[PDB]
C-alpha cells in the first residue's frame, strides 16, 4: 500500500529481508565550503 | 531512488540501526625553541573565560566535554618570535621581573570539519619514562574524540552483491510503503539497478 | 549480583512504569549502578543531537522516540449491506505501548484532523 | 507550531477553476489533507446529470 | 563464523569450564585443569581508519 | 641548524614544495622600529643618570659583545662588582 | 562576603595530576603581569599590582589583585592603591580577571624612566 | 547601590540547561524562604514583591520589596528561594 494515499500499488511488489551495509564513506570526511581565508606564501592560492 | 540513489525509513534512526561510532585523534607537541621553551598550560593570554571553561588546570580539555570546531583541546603558549634580542632586552630581563617577556598562544583547536566528545587523553612528559621523543620535543599530548554517526543523507550503503548507492531521502515512517498489516518497509531500492 | 529490570526504579507518585520486566542491565558481585534518568513528554522523533538535554554536566542526552504507536493498519472490506454491495466496512487496528490506549490515541488523532480542517476557515489574497 | 496557524489563500477565477494554497503545515500533512480531500471532491460531491 | 574466528576479532574459551566474573572490562573463567584465567577486553579502541 | 631550502618534497614525496604548506600571518610586523626608538633612548637616559662605571660595566658586558663576573671588573673585587651592580640596579629602578 | 562566589568559580576548574607551579608573586617592585578581562580583552593597569593568594591548585591559583595607580611626589612617583579585582593566575603569571575591577572610592618613590620603560613594554596606562 | 550586585550575580555558574521558571512571589502569595548572606533565615513582616533585573537559565537577580516597609537585593533559583546579598535596608 502507498503510505501517503492508502491506495494500493497497481501491481504486486517483491519485498523481503536484505543484508545491506554502511560503508566508510560517510558525509563528514566530505563536505567543505570555502569563503575566504589563508593563502600559501610563495604561490598565493589559498589553504586552510 | 533515481540513478542509484536509495531511500530510507526514518525508523532506522529511532531504533539506532545504521549508526556507527567513530573516533578521531588529535595531537600536539610542546617543541623547544630558540626564543625559549613552549609550555602546555591553561593560561593562554587573549582568551575569554568562556573559551577556557572546559580545560583542566593543565590546559588539556577535560574528559567527556563536547567540543566544537574552533574549541581548544590543548592550550600551548610559545614566546614571541624573531628570537632573543640580547643587546637591549637581555638587560631588561635583569632590570624587570626576570621572565617578564611576552608569550603568544599557539594551541590545539578542533579543525573545521568537527570533533565530538573527548574520551581519552595521553601525555608523554619529560623525564621520559620509556619514550623516544624527537629532538627539540619536550612532551606531546593526544586527545581522542568520538562521535556517534547516524545515517545522514549523503551516506553510502551497499549490499553484498555490489549495489553501490547513496542515501538520498529519509522518509518519515508514516508515508512510506507498508504491507497489509501496518508494517512498513525500511528501504526502497530502484529495480532499474538490476 | 542482580539483573536490574525497569521495575528496579524507585516509584514516583503519578507515574506508571509500563515495562517492568525490561532488562536494564546486569550487575555481578560488587557491581554498582546508580543513576537518574529523565523522562519527558513530547511529540514525534527528537534525537539527542537536536534537543541536547542535561540536568547535570555528566549527563548524556538520549534520542527521543515519543509516539506510543507501534503500528497502524486500516482494513477495507466489502460489506454488502441491504441494497448495494460496493460498500466499505472499515476497521482500523491500533497497537500501543500502553502509555496511552489505542482508543485515546485514535480520538486524539481524529481531533488533530478536524482541527486541521479548521484551517480552511478564512481565505485571502 | 500553533502560531504557524496556516494561511489559507486563494486565487479564484470564475466558477470553473480555483487554486487554493495552504501553508505552512507540519511534515507530510499536505498529503494527509490533500489526498483524502480529493477523494471526497471527486466522488461524494452532490450534483445532476443526464 | 570461521572469519571472525581466524581473524582475532572475538574471544573464545580455551577449555571447557565455567564463568567466574564478567565486567564490561574483562571476563574471568574457571577451567577444568584447575586454572582460572582473566581476559581483559579492548574496551573502546581506535583503528587506523 | 641552518635555514632549510624553500623547495623540498613534503609528506608523500610526490610534488609538494614546502612553500605550498605555509600560510601568511601579518605584513606590518609592528612594535619594532617604534619600540626600539623608545627603548634605546629611555635605556640610555637612565644609563646616563647613574655613575658611568656601574652602568657601562654590564651595559657592554651584557650588551656589546658577549654574555662574565669573574672577568667583569676592569680590576676590583668580585665583591665590589656584585655590590655596585646590584645597588646600581636598585637605585636605578626606584629612586628615593 | 564578595569573595566566595569567586572561590566557587575557582574550585570549579577541573583538576589534573601534575606537579606544583611556582607562581609569579607580582608586587609594586615588579612588572604587573598581563591582565585580561573575562571578555579576553587586555586590561592595562595604571601601575603595579599586589597579589593575595586565597586558593591554589597544582598549576593555577586564585588571587585578590590590588591595582595601584602611580602619582607624582618628589623626583618621580609613588604607588597608591587604586582598585581591586579577583582573578586566577596561571603558571605564565598571567592574571585572568573574574570581573571588571572595582574602582576604590576616596614613603617610597620610583623613577621617571622606570615608568617610561613600563609605558614602552605596555603594562602601564599613560597620563 | 545596585551595580555591585550585577557583578556579584554575573559571578554565578552559567549552567546551560533549559530555562527554569522562577516563582514570582507577590502580596497575593506566601513569602518564600529568604536567607541572609550568612545563610541565616530572615523572616519578613509581611509578603514580598519582586522586580526581575537579570536572568540566566537557572537563576535571576531581583529587587525584593517587603511590605507590612523595606527592600533588599537577592538572587533567586528554580526553588524560588531568595538568597539575599545583604540584610534588608529599612526605608
From Swiss-Prot, chain C:
Domain of life: Bacteria
TM regions (residue ranges): none
The record's note on its domains: The N-terminal domain is essential for RNAP assembly and basal transcription, whereas the C-terminal domain is involved in interaction with transcriptional regulators and with upstream promoter elements.
Family: Belongs to the RNA polymerase alpha chain family.
Subunit structure: Homodimer. The RNAP catalytic core consists of 2 alpha, 1 beta, 1 beta' and 1 omega subunit. When a sigma factor is associated with the core the holoenzyme is formed, which can initiate transcription.
Biological function: DNA-dependent RNA polymerase catalyzes the transcription of DNA into RNA using the four ribonucleoside triphosphates as substrates.
UniProt name for this protein: DNA-directed RNA polymerase subunit alpha
Full-length numbering of the shown residues: 106 to 230 of 315
UniProtKB/Swiss-Prot annotation, chain E:
Superkingdom: Bacteria
Complex and partners: The RNAP catalytic core consists of 2 alpha, 1 beta, 1 beta' and 1 omega subunit. When a sigma factor is associated with the core the holoenzyme is formed, which can initiate transcription.
Reported function: DNA-dependent RNA polymerase catalyzes the transcription of DNA into RNA using the four ribonucleoside triphosphates as substrates.
Family per similarity comment: Belongs to the RNA polymerase beta chain family.
Name of the featured protein: DNA-directed RNA polymerase subunit beta
Gene name per UniProt: rpoB
Amino acid at each position: 500500500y502507498d503510505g501517503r494515499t492508502g491506495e494500493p500499488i497497481e501491481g504486486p511488489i517483491v519485498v523481503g529481508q536484505m543484508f545491506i551495509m554502511k560503508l566508510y564513506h560517510m558525509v563528514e570526511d566530505k563536505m567543505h565550503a570555502r569563503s575566504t581565508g589563508p593563502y600559501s606564501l610563495i604561490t598565493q592560492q589559498p589553504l586552510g | 531512488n533515481f540513478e542509484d540513489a536509495i531511500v530510507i525509513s526514518e525508523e532506522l534512526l529511532k531504533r539506532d540501526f545504521y549508526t556507527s561510532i567513530h573516533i578521531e585523534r588529535y595531537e600536539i607537541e610542546a617543541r623547544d625553541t630558540k626564543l625559549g621553551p613552549e609550555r602546555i598550560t591553561r593560561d593562554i593570554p587573549h582568551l575569554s573565560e568562556a573559551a577556557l571553561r572546559d580545560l583542566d588546570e593543565e590546559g588539556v580539555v577535560r574528559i567527556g566535554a563536547e567540543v566544537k570546531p574552533g574549541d581548544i583541546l590543548v592550550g600551548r603558549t610559545s614566546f614571541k618570535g624573531e628570537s632573543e634580542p640580547t643587546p637591549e632586552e637581555r638587560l631588561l630581563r635583569s632590570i624587570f621581573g626576570e621572565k617578564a617577556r611576552d608569550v603568544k598562544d599557539t594551541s590545539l583547536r578542533v579543525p573545521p570539519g568537527e570533533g565530538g566528545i573527548v574520551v581519552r587523553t595521553v601525555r608523554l612528559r619529560r623525564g621520559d619514562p620509556g619514550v623516544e621523543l624527537k629532538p627539540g620535543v619536550r612532551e606531546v599530548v593526544r586527545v581522542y574524540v568520538a562521535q556517534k554517526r547516524k545515517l545522514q543523507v549523503g551516506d553510502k550503503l551497499a549490499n553484498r552483491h555490489g549495489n553501490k548507492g547513496v542515501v538520498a531521502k529519509i522518509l518519515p515512517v508514516e508515508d512510506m510503503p507498508h504491507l497489509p498489516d501496518g508494517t512498513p518497509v525500511d528501504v526502497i531500492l530502484n529495480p532499474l539497478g538490476v | 549480583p542482580k539483573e536490574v529490570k525497569a521495575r528496579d526504579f524507585l516509584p514516583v507518585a503519578d507515574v506508571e512504569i509500563m515495562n517492568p520486566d525490561l532488562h536494564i542491565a546486569t550487575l555481578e558481585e560488587g557491581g554498582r549502578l546508580n543513576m537518574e534518568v529523565r523522562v519527558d513528554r513530547g511529540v514525534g522523533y527528537v534525537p539527542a543531537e537536536k534537543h541536547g538535554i542535561k540536568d547535570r554536566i555528566n549527563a548524556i542526552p538520549v534520542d527521543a522516540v515519543f509516539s506510543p504507536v507501534r503500528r497502524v493498519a486500516f482494513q477495507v472490506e466489502d460489506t454488502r449491506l441491504g441494497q448495494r454491495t460496493d460498500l466499505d466496512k472499515l476497521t482500523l487496528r491500533i497497537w500501543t505501548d500502553g502509555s496511552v490506549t489505542p482508543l485515546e490515541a485514535l480520538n486524539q488523532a481524529v481531533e488533530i484532523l478536524r482541527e486541521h480542517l479548521t484551517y480552511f476557515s478564512n481565505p485571502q489574497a | 507550531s500553533k502560531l504557524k496557524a496556516p494561511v489559507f489563500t486563494v486565487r479564484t477565477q470564475g466558477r470553473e477553476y480555483g487554486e487554493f494554497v495552504l501553508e505552512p503545515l507540519e511534515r507530510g500533512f499536505g498529503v494527509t489533507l490533500g489526498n483524502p480531500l480529493r477523494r471526497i471532491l471527486l466522488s461524494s460531491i452532490p450534483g445532476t446529470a443526464v | 563464523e570461521r572469519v571472525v574466528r581466524d581473524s582475532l576479532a572475538a574471544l573464545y574459551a580455551e577449555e571447557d569450564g565455567e564463568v567466574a566474573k564478567v565486567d564490561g572490562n574483562r571476563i574471568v573463567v574457571r577451567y577444568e585443569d584447575g586454572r582460572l584465567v582473566e581476559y581483559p577486553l579492548r574496551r573502546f579502541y581506535r583503528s587506523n581508519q | 641548524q641552518e635555514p632549510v631550502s624553500l623547495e623540498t618534497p613534503i609528506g608523500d614525496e610526490k610534488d609538494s614544495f614546502y612553500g605550498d604548506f605555509i600560510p601568511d600571518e601579518h605584513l606590518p610586523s609592528p612594535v619594532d622600529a617604534a619600540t626600539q626608538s623608545l627603548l634605546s633612548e629611555e635605556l640610555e637616559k637612565a644609563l646616563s643618570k647613574l655613575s658611568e662605571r656601574e652602568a657601562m660595566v654590564l651595559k657592554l658586558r651584557k650588551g656589546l659583545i658577549d654574555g662574565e663576573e669573574v672577568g667583569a671588573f676592569f680590576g676590583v673585587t668580585r665583591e665590589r662588582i656584585r655590590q655596585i651592580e646590584n645597588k646600581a640596579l636598585r637605585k636605578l629602578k626606584y629612586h628615593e | 562576603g564578595f569573595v566566595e562566589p569567586y572561590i566557587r568559580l575557582f574550585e570549579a576548574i577541573p583538576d589534573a595530576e601534575t606537579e606544583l607551579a611556582t607562581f609569579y608573586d607580582a608586587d609594586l617592585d615588579t612588572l604587573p603581569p598581563r591582565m585580561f578581562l573575562p571578555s579576553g580583552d587586555l586590561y592595562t593597569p595604571p601601575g603595579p599590582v599586589r597579589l593575595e593568594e586565597i586558593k591554589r591548585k597544582r598549576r593555577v591559583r586564585l588571587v585578590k589583585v590590588s591595582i595601584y595607580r602611580f602619582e607624582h611626589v618628589g623626583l618621580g612617583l609613588a604607588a597608591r592603591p587604586y582598585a581591586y579585582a579577583y582573578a586566577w593566575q596561571g603558571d605564565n603569571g598571567i592574571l585572568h580577571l573574574y570581573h571588571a575591577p572595582v574602582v576604590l572610592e576616596d614613603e617610597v618613590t620610583y623613577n621617571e624612566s622606570y615608568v617610561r620603560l613600563m609605558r614602552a613594554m605596555g603594562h602601564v596606562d599613560a597620563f
